[PDB]
Design a protein around this ligand. Structure first.
Ligand code: PQQ
Ligand code: CA
Ligand code: CL
Ligand code: ZN
Ligand code: ZN
Ligand code: ZN
Ligand code: ZN
Length: 562
């Protein structure tokens, strides 16, 4: 019935033109994480009730209810993909991939899945075994699949999910446990043919190779692009970011002094070809697993940064002050520094720290980052008191945009990392080859935090704090609300103007996944994926007074009483 008269998903849908739907991870191509739906607002949110819910597969539950014309498309863990009636919560179809023994996968991160993608009459995802897979949206039955290579025992996978642009499925990758780097690919959405593949680690003698400190090519590991991909239709530019290299210590890498061209770089590329239009390295010489791979938003804003705003690192030499620009903006790396660029040219406008950070000594008026020499992991076994941590700061949990107030709303953790490089030799299995203790940032008694930053001035308008880590995405809405989950298991709504909590419900486990909103027959629904991720186990022990249990993975859906 719900699936019956399925209409093909177009670029108009994916650009977020129909606010009744949420047909892409952040509601629109541009990465806003916003629903224009305004039925639910601060005056009635207190009445929100559970309408329906459904159990999801076990494991790290970071996915999103992709809603389209009354149907929820839902990536579970373990390559289980569901269509669910968005009104009743009844299963419509389920695809369950045949998996080899989990022990065969060296990269367990590929079990989690932040999104599927929609285009035409197909659902698109990347499997744990590193295939781009297309299912029939109407039935969940496989239409085609294409092996990208190096899956399973070789550890290339994907955790964020693809987007489809101009008939091209664009998907990044994680190779966290591999003795090599990885890539972003574009795949034809109808034929399944790989059209292009962009890599990051320079080959010997090629542009950037001299920034790797002499490290043999085969010793350059783990540089990937595992975060969220965004897109601007008008400019026709796809945006993604690459990550760092392992192990964390440049001494152990053999890259002393190396700024590591290709790593932690923000790329703007043409969707059909992968051609790089512009790029900017947001964290050079990474010794801190900084991963500048997180979603970056395309918004139009007046440009007027305050050099005295809290955390402001620097303002661009050629900042077009007072002018309105389409910008690429947000926090790309775990470090928690917000950046703003001209979306078309990559001209640097400004950058601004949020959480306590000590990896970046300065950023000059061109956007050139100089790292803090004191935090380079130069002596194995020495404890370096890094701020933030290998989980931020920010991490994958996405920001939201409030277009009425021009606020960028980002969930953050007030944590620092007492980290040391192990004294034993690093292998790819060892990842960053570090041991660490996580602590609250200096003078902070609240681990969970949400900052709302004015994109014109860089001023923080409000900041919400709570005892335990949030480590969960935000949803912003046209009802002037911000929804966010936490490891305290609360799913809460904040007043978008003040940051003050106006409603909450407590879910059975840490609220670990995305929140989306859609409507059916005029009724607004708010859907959250819950149960647990790496967040609770990591941040929970710092605030053991909070009951941060994981469990009961599911989608949980709320609405006002009929
Ligand atoms: O370097 C990589 O390839 C890679 C992949 C992943 C993943 O795909 O989830 C994470 C990280 N890195 C990472 O550094 C990190 O802190 C992290 C947290 C999470 C999560 O699910 O909470 N995934 C990942
Ligand atoms: Ca990583
Ligand atoms: Cl529609
Ligand atoms: Zn449509
Ligand atoms: Zn630049
Ligand atoms: Zn100011
Ligand atoms: Zn509450």
């Amino acid at each position: 019935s719900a699936i019956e008269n399925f209409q093909p998903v177009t670029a108009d849908d994916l650009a977020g033109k129909n606010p009744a739907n949420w047909p892409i991870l952040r509601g629109n191509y541009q990465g806003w994480g916003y629903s224009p739906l305004d039925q639910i607002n601060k005056d009635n949110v207190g009445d929100l009730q559970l309408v329906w819910s459904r159990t999801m597969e076990p494991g790290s539950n970071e996915g999103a209810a992709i809603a389209y014309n009354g149907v929820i498309f839902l990536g579970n863990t373990n390559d289980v993909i569901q269509a669910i009636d968005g009104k009743t919560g009844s299963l419509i179809w389920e695809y369950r991939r045949k998996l080899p023994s989990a022990s065969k996968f060296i990269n367990s991160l590929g079990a989690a899945k932040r999104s599927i993608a929609l285009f035409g009459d197909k659902v698109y995802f990347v499997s744990w075994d590193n295939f781009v897979v297309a299912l029939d949206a109407k039935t969940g039955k496989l239409a085609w699949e294409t092996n990208r290579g190096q899956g399973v025992e070789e550890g290339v996978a994907n955790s964020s999910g693809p987007i489809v642009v101009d008939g091209v499925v664009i998907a990044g990758s994680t190779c966290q446990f591999s003795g090599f780097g990885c890539y972003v690919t574009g795949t034809d959405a109808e034929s399944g043919e790989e059209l292009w593949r962009n890599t990051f680690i320079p080959r010997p003698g090629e542009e950037g190779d001299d920034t790797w400190g002499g490290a043999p090519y085969e010793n350059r590991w783990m540089t990937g692009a595992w975060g969220q991909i965004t897109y601007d239709p008008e400019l026709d530019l796809v945006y993604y970011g690459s990550t760092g290299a392992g192990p964390a210590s440049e001494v152990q890498r053999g890259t002393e002094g190396g700024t590591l061209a290709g790593t932690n770089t923000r790329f703007a590329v043409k969707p059909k070809t992968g051609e790089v239009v512009w790029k900017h390295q947001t964290l050079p010489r990474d010794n801190w697993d900084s991963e500048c791979t997180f979603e970056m938003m395309v918004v139009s804003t007046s440009v007027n940064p305050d050099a005295k705003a809290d955390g402001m690192m620097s303002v661009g030499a050629n900042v077009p002050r007072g002018e309105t620009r389409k910008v690429l903006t947000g926090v790309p790396c775990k470090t928690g520094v917000a950046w703003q660029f001209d979306a078309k040219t990559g001209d640097y406008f400004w950058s601004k720290a949020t959480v306590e950070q000590n990896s970046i000594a300065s950023i000059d008026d061109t956007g050139l980052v100089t790292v803090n020499e004191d935090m380079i992991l130069k002596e194995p076994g020495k404890t370096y008191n890094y701020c933030p941590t290998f989980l931020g700061g920010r991490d994958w949990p996405s920001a939201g945009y409030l277009p009425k107030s021009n606020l960028y709303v980002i969930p953050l953790s007030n944590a620092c990392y007492d980290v040391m490089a192990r004294t034993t030799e690093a292998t790819p299995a060892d990842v960053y080859n570090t041991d660490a203790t996580l602590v609250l940032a200096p003078g902070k008694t609240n681990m969970g935090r949400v900052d709302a930053i004015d994109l014109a001035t860089g001023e923080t308008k409000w900041s919400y704090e709570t005892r335990a880590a949030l480590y969960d995405p935000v949803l912003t809405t046209g009802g002037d609300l911000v929804f966010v989950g936490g490891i305290d298991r609360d799913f809460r709504a904040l007043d978008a103007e003040s940051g003050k909590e106006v409603w909450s419900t407590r879910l059975p486990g840490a609220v670990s996944g995305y929140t989306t909103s859609y409507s059916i027959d005029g009724r607004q629904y708010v859907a959250v994926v819950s149960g647990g991720s790496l967040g609770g186990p990591t941040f929970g022990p710092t605030t053991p007074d909070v009951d941060s249990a994981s469990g009961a993975n599911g989608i949980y859906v709320f609405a006002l009483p009929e």
